[PDB]
């Protein structure tokens, strides 16, 4: 039997996180507990009012197929949110609800990118952006950023990398993995560059929108001059509302593009969960920015961020870019590369450093090479201050003998 | 402006009928709706309670991409106890419904230019999923006089070295036909001559089956295990369509590839739905009495419809033995003229006539690759069906003149 696979599924890169995940299990399966800082999800429960709506949907028998694009009441609520929070005007037929925002993103990429098109992706990047480009038979063009610039795209670098083939720029703000927030003035410079190239669209991943630390503010890319008709706005419920397991995300965009994504979704999964969609309606019903329910999570995230930064920031050889959003610190420990650790061996890149932290000191983190930047390691602070204080002590002890 | 691949996708043809139906209903005009592809029954109470408990207990975080271990294990047990198949948990991939399971299988194994063999009448998405893999759908018509089952000679005549996937849906949507084991064996003997040819076995209607008909998993046949992608799920048997939970079982190498694809498509399925799925499998072999009650209702409805519609002059019916659809040949009526409507000459016009003039909504067979028929769903109560048969009788009466 011929077991050959399609070239596209073969083009998918190997996991750079697998080894951490596997070693953590291995360590636990022995006698060794592990501090987990690798997860890309909130540690909080889904808000009570949201869970209530989900339970209610089940009891009321709202358990049948929905419209492919999503239930009307949810798409209407999304339009109100985009208007109230982001100043954007969309009609319900410009919204597509999917099983999480990852699906919204994939479908956008597959709908707009033709083979050979180039997809511009600033690094450090969310792992899936490059792979989704590949599934479109498109070419990722990665643009590295610098920690001293808070990992923000340099517009001059963008201009340098544009070609006739450039089709899509993917912008994540607030960012996974850096927690950086793009300021409006920089977005306006980027937008002026995009406006000069008719073929160039922008995929704006805004999933962390409400996980933001005042006075930092979120600017939707679609609100910039002349950018509405070339922007695919992606957002959802996983991060702001601790609804990762529910699987609910969405895309708002130009009708011609949204129709194409909707057609694709009709072959991929049909409508998102009827139950999850009712919960999403309730989440949006919490009012602007999720109201006090979300504000409490954000206050906790801020305490955690502030503690982590002050704690790790005073370790020799550590560089930090202060995040203004999300719940990740993308930390430069590269000064330690070249070190030899007893009972482990050479630490000379993000992967070996992360594996050293876990194998020898029981703290699981994600190496920066997973995000296209080997100079750093991603730490998630979606865990309690108690876990964070414990992790900080382990990290200190781990770096101590490396000098 | 848009990728050629998304461009290549055909839109539905079914939205017209279903939208007009909804409109009429919201207008104070009662429509008997027989167009749905989902059970009338609620999700079973024990299963619904499990999803509710999952929510209350905080099982609302991301699962393993492939699915929670508990569920993949339970799926392995089901495949053994119900289908006689042995799979390991790393040979199972849980997705957001079986439609996603199917799409990922197609994308994983088909290279550009490969052929996907799809017997008609087919479920609508199969041809579109093939296009998404840059593969060529090769449709093989079946005949109502063969119970809409593949003639092995027709399969043989269409096989090439490019033939990469054969899609076998049994019990079938839209025909209700069940592949007998002896026929599956003949097909397997033909497949064995072609090393490139894999089989995608869509077994979602497995438990919706009418004794003495039985379900044979394709992967159970001699030498077929290593070349079969077994797809099944929860939507149909357990009335869980809105929950979004399905799965693939197959050779580890292929399932691993599907899992990698899924990592870029959607990540893991709903944590809540997966907990409900565990409870559904916990109802016992074939869904226990819970599913048995549904099947009993379905059978009564099938028997009634087949007897009633079969009595009508110019109506041809096959021998449905599963699912909850009748794919009815009204083609003898094409060319007729209806007052206040005009010419009826294809399945689309006939469906529109049935709906506009007689308030019964059904799906034109053209949607499934066979314009000679109309699909009627009997996922509705017997009393409603009795009313629908009466309307259909009255709708066809003046067309015979
Ligand atoms: C979590 C995340 C998303 C959305 O995830 P879903 O759970 O699929 O909604 C999108 N972008 C980034 C960078 C994320 O981290
Ligand atoms: C309903 C159905 C499926 C599965 O649908 P999901 O709800 O996506 O699980 C698969 N094949 C056929 C023919 C169906 O009718
Ligand atoms: Na805002
Ligand atoms: Na069986």
UniProtKB/Swiss-Prot annotation, chain A:
Q: Which organism is it from?
A: Arabidopsis thaliana
Which parts of the sequence carry N6-(pyridoxal phosphate)lysine? 239
- Shown residues within the full chain: 68 to 470 of 475
Q: What does this protein do?
A: Prokaryotic-type aspartate aminotransferase. Also has a prenate transaminase activity. Involved in the aromatic amino acids biosynthesis pathway via the arogenate route. Required for the transamination of prephenate into arogenate. Required for early development of the embryo.
Q: Where in the cell is it found?
A: Plastid, Chloroplast
Q: What are the entry keywords? A: Amino-acid biosynthesis, Aminotransferase, Chloroplast, Plastid, Pyridoxal phosphate, Transferase, Transit peptide
The name on file for this protein is: Bifunctional aspartate aminotransferase and glutamate/aspartate-prephenate aminotransferase
The organism that produces this protein has a lineage beginning with: Eukaryota, Viridiplantae, Streptophyta, Embryophyta, Tracheophyta
Q: In which pathway does it act?
A: Amino-acid biosynthesis; L-phenylalanine biosynthesis; L-arogenate from prephenate (L-Asp route): step 1/1; Amino-acid biosynthesis; L-phenylalanine biosynthesis; L-arogenate from prephenate (L-Glu route): step 1/1
> EC annotation?
2.6.1.1, 2.6.1.78, 2.6.1.79
What chemistry does it catalyse, as a reaction equation? L-aspartate + 2-oxoglutarate = oxaloacetate + L-glutamate; L-arogenate + oxaloacetate = prephenate + L-aspartate; L-arogenate + 2-oxoglutarate = prephenate + L-glutamate
Needs which cofactor?
pyridoxal 5'-phosphate
Curated annotation (Swiss-Prot), chain B:
Protein's cellular compartments: Plastid, Chloroplast
Query: Which GO terms of the cellular component aspect does the record hold?
Result: chloroplast; chloroplast stroma
Protein's GO biological process: aromatic amino acid family biosynthetic process, prephenate pathway; embryo development ending in seed dormancy; L-phenylalanine biosynthetic process
Provide the binding site for L-aspartate.
Answer: 37, 123, 173, 375
Q: In which pathway does it act?
A: Amino-acid biosynthesis; L-phenylalanine biosynthesis; L-arogenate from prephenate (L-Asp route): step 1/1; Amino-acid biosynthesis; L-phenylalanine biosynthesis; L-arogenate from prephenate (L-Glu route): step 1/1
EC annotation?
2.6.1.1, 2.6.1.78, 2.6.1.79
Question: Catalyzes what?
Answer: L-aspartate + 2-oxoglutarate = oxaloacetate + L-glutamate; L-arogenate + oxaloacetate = prephenate + L-aspartate; L-arogenate + 2-oxoglutarate = prephenate + L-glutamate
The Gene Ontology terms for molecular function here are: aspartate-prephenate aminotransferase activity; glutamate-prephenate aminotransferase activity; L-aspartate:2-oxoglutarate aminotransferase activity; pyridoxal phosphate binding
Name the cofactor(s).
pyridoxal 5'-phosphate
Its main subcellular localisation, reduced to a broad class, is plastid
Q: How does it assemble?
A: Homodimer.
Q: What role does it play? A: Prokaryotic-type aspartate aminotransferase. Also has a prenate transaminase activity. Involved in the aromatic amino acids biosynthesis pathway via the arogenate route. Required for the transamination of prephenate into arogenate. Required for early development of the embryo.
Q: What is this protein called?
A: Bifunctional aspartate aminotransferase and glutamate/aspartate-prephenate aminotransferase
Q: Which gene encodes it?
A: PAT
Range of the intact protein held here: 71 to 471 of 475
């Amino acid at each position: 039997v011929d077991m050959s696979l399609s070239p596209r599924v073969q083009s998918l890169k190997p996991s750079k996180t697998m080894v951490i995940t596997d070693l953590a299990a291995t360590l636990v399966q022995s006698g060794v507990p592990v501090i987990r800082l690798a997860a890309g999800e909130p540690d909080f429960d889904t808000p009570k009012v949201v869970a209530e709506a989900g339970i209610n949907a089940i009891r009321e028998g709202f358990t049948r197929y929905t419209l492919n694009a999503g239930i009307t009441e949810l798409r209407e609520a999304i339009c109100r949110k985009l208007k109230e929070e982001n100043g954007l005007s969309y009609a319900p037929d410009q919204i597509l609800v999917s099983n999480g925002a990852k699906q919204s993103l994939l479908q956008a990429v597959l709908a707009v990118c033709s083979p050979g098109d180039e997809v511009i992706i600033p690094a450090p990047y969310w792992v899936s952006y490059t792979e989704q480009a590949r599934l479109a038979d498109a070419t990722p063009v990665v643009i590295p950023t610098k920690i001293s610039n808070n990992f923000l795209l340099d517009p001059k670098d963008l201009e340098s990398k544009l070609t006739e083939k450039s089709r899509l720029l993917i912008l994540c703000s607030p960012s996974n993995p850096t927690g950086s927030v793009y300021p409006k003035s920089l977005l306006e410079e980027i937008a002026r560059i995009i406006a000069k190239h008719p073929r160039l669209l922008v995929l704006s991943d805004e999933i962390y929108e409400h996980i933001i630390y005042a006075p930092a503010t979120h600017t939707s890319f679609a609100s910039l001059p002349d950018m509405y008709e070339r922007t695919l706005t992606v957002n959802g419920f996983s991060k702001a509302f601790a609804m990762t397991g529910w699987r609910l995300g969405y895309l708002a965009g130009p009708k011609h593009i949204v129709a194409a994504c909707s057609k694709l979704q009709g072959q991929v999964s049909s409508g998102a969960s009827s139950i999850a969609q009712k919960a999403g309606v309730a989440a949006l019903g919490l009012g602007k920015a999720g109201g006090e329910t979300v504000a409490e999570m954000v206050k906790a995230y801020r305490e955690r961020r502030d503690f982590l930064v002050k704690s790790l920031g005073d370790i020799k050889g550590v560089k930090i870019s202060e995040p203004q959003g999300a719940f990740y610190l993308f930390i430069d420990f590269s000064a330690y590369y070249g070190s030899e650790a007893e009972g482990f061996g050479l630490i000379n890149d993000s992967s070996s450093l992360a594996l050293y932290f876990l194998d020898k000191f029981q703290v699981a983190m994600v190496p920066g090479d997973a995000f296209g930047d080997d100079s750093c390691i991603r730490i998630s602070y979606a865990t309690s201050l108690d876990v964070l204080q414990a992790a900080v002590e382990k990290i200190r002890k781990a770096l101590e003998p490396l000098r």
